[PDB]
Amino acid sequence: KPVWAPHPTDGFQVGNIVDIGPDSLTIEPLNQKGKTFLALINQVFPAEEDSKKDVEDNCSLMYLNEATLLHNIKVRYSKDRIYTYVANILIAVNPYFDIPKIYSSETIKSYQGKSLGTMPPHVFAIADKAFRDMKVLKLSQSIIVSGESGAGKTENTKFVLRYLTESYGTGQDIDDRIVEANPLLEAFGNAKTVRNNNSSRFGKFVEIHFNEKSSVVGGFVSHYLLEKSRICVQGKEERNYHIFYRLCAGASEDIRERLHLSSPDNFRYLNRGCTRYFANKETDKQILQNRKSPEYLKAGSLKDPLLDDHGDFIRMCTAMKKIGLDDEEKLDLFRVVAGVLHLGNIDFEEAGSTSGGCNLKNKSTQALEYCAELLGLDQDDLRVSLTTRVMLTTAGGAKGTVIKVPLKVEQANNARDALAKTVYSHLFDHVVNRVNQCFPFETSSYFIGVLDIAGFEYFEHNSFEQFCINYCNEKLQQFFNERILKEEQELYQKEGLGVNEVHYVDNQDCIDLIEARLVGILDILDEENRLPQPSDQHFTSAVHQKHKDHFRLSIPRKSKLAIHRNIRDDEGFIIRHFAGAVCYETTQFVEKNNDALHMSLESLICESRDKFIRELFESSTNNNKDTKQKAGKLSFISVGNKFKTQLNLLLDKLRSTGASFIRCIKPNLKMTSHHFEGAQILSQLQCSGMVSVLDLMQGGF
Amino acid sequence: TTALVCDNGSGLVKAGFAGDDAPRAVFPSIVGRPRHQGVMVGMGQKDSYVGDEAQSKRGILTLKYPIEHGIITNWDDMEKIWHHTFYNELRVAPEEHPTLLTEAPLNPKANREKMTQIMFETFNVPAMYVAIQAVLSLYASGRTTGIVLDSGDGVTHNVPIYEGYALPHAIMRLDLAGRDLTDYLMKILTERGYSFVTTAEREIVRDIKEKLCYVALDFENEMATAASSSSLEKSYELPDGQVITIGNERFRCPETLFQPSFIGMESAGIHETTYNSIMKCDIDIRKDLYANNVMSGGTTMYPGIADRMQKEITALAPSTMKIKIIAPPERKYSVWIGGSILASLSTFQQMWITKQEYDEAGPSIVH
């Protein structure tokens, strides 16, 4: 009987055992004189009784492991059986081509009202399952779509909304707005990453509300984990947001000369990263000479299978008139995006009478004039607001006056950068509030949520935002360990079958290491901004200072990898996670955690003459400033307690509702049909908990 | 893969991989604890700053060079040199390199034993070799004969080598240069009303030992031209704004290397250790020791050496004999360019002490 040998090009290949001893297992490949090497227990997995069988559900595979699971998916890739039941978790493979059977309306009409497991694995077999619990136990259901970036978590999401608007009433008044508006909000939040060219930098959460009789009453889409740190530092091959490259590329010269827009190389928040446009040969020649950066003149257009920046600007503005946005209101939306561009071009210096204060540079005089025309707040009043710390003596006595204490040059740059992240935060909430307005909900009871957020993210240069993304995946996997493993084994003993209430390998010590008070990593980073003379070297050395030993973390010096050999003590830290050990580099950590405004910038942008800017900063953010109201809260706040509040609030909506477990697997890196990578596909099974769930459940049955 | 060249100078400890180009790391050696009470409380300030940061912290630490008269201060501080260099300077892994360590041509035991043993048991290095700083300067010169000068802080040496073995009966170690020249500059700079008694601040003296000192063509005649004072008085600027004018003492300090009685030692100058080592070599071989006088080390980079040394040796050396003093470029890194040539040379990879041979012998039989 043969076993499975790890192979570099196949991941796992077939092979017999021809000499045997622990730590000296000689595995010969099947009818091949190839890798005739020796192994270890973690390098040898048994094979099935026969290799000529492929199964719909993996409940019929006795020698189930990762090599027999990647082999069942390799055969069902051939037969176009992309949807595959793994335990109680849907694994979906993106085929990257049009298959008529999945797009057939008879496929939805057959599956209409049919029980899970008595009918083939399909996308509609999960959407009916999180509707039968509304009739059994009377409980709300959260659809969570997980998987790599660009894996079809947004495209498979439209199949789920199409099943709900066809098998359980006709659903909400008009569906198609949700489909049309997703590339619109992906102008604002999608960017370009090393993992995939079209990648999402935010966690959208659709909330389709219903009533007591399970009929739809309206919708609400919100957003969680917005990558605002992309505004200040873009990267090297990464872009910033995709709205600035969609606004300067094709738009009028009687709009670009008037909003004072120019080529990407002139703006500070576009002076790092990739300034090239996504385009195709006809769209590239439609881009005018003045709209090109030096890098575009050198290297031309970027390559993507569907993104065209000059093409997508028409399909952006057509999707605006489909959500009810007026063309004059699109011009007020263009004034806010252009106002962020002329806010970034404020360059500060020292000098002046105070000497230790801050002033502005001479070259930012033409740029400050265009900034006060776009925002609706005066140039002189913005120059003595970016540079000062306003406080009063009225609270302490009837001799009251309001003094000003000039800030440092670095705190002027961090206040301008925090004011830029604050405007884009409320601008993104205004666009989703404009779409939410057209499908409001009346008397909610039950509701079906649909999550669309990034999986584990790790590459050559990881940072703060990749640690918040990998921590959110580590919190979701502990949720899945009490909902996929603890809950399901209560159900095998509710049918009297058997199986024990066996425990998993927990990560509760790692959870109380990142977000834990006093000794956690985020509680030492959030203390760094409160310190005078803050540094990334002082924060990185403060983790290793607080706990000398701890198996969940290590510094790059203590890592055996060659890539970490070139990284010093004070240059990064490595956290061991469910997906392995990921190094996050430290640099700009102080400013990335900084995202807050005091009263001198708040009593100017909120009180703007422009009603649109004033409505971005809507009530209760906008409030009258008056005598003895009576304290200077909330001060620092920080990105880390913005993210911890908005992550633990989504945990209370997940722990309180039922759920569906969907994993979307990318079979090849170039995104085309009929190509099976095998090793990159294995990494999506190894960075999704699949190996651990298919060993704990098996037991005595 | 590649071997690691580490020269255990007292400078200017030098570190760089085995070829093809210059040392990667040079640093002022020092370890320094913080000698004031920290009322800001830090936060988390270092227990010991090593160089380079311990030279960015003058006047607030108490600097201690890790080797003192060619012997370690203690291996507790020496190990911090090693650990700091490999991890926090070079970015080299301990078990990924054969290493090369250097010592003095004449140094007491157990300084090479204890070293070899502690680095093998602590850092677990897979191969090691220990070369004398003079032999590596022969490889740097390229010649096959000659008297070799490793003059570094704080120990100089005069080693004669003849194709291709060392001569036992003429090896001279003089403890004249270079830390006693630093301390002597501090002793004759008080003569102009300055003070530098503070340990950290002694480094400022070392920096003035570098730039403005000059050797005379002849002592007696520079003392003559000193009586005609003007051009001798040169104005240095000091980091707190102070302007120092040194002139007579300016040529007096380096002049020390000839007639060292001024320091307090009874042994004669570079002059006589050269002559007296040559005149303990056999008559026939002396012919090719003349004109293969090869200088090395950073403490030979004072201006006026070697042509003071040339004129003085040439006056005492035999009539109608050729005596040229060979002075290479960049002598401070000579020793290192030696180490680089050695560890790169085929097939002498198999003349190193490897971990299996070390496991068998421990700190025994170091020859």
Ligand SMILES: Nc1ncnc2c1ncn2[C@@H]1O[C@H](COP(=O)(O)OP(=O)(O)O)[C@@H](O)[C@H]1O
């Ligand atoms: N231009 C110079 N003139 C005079 N002395 C110098 C000069 N540059 C360096 N030195 C001295 O040389 C010493 C460095 O010598 P080095 O070759 O490193 O000896 P070792 O290799 O034995 O440590 C320093 O202590 C310094 O005082």
Ligand SMILES: [Mg+2]
């Ligand atoms: Mg030396």
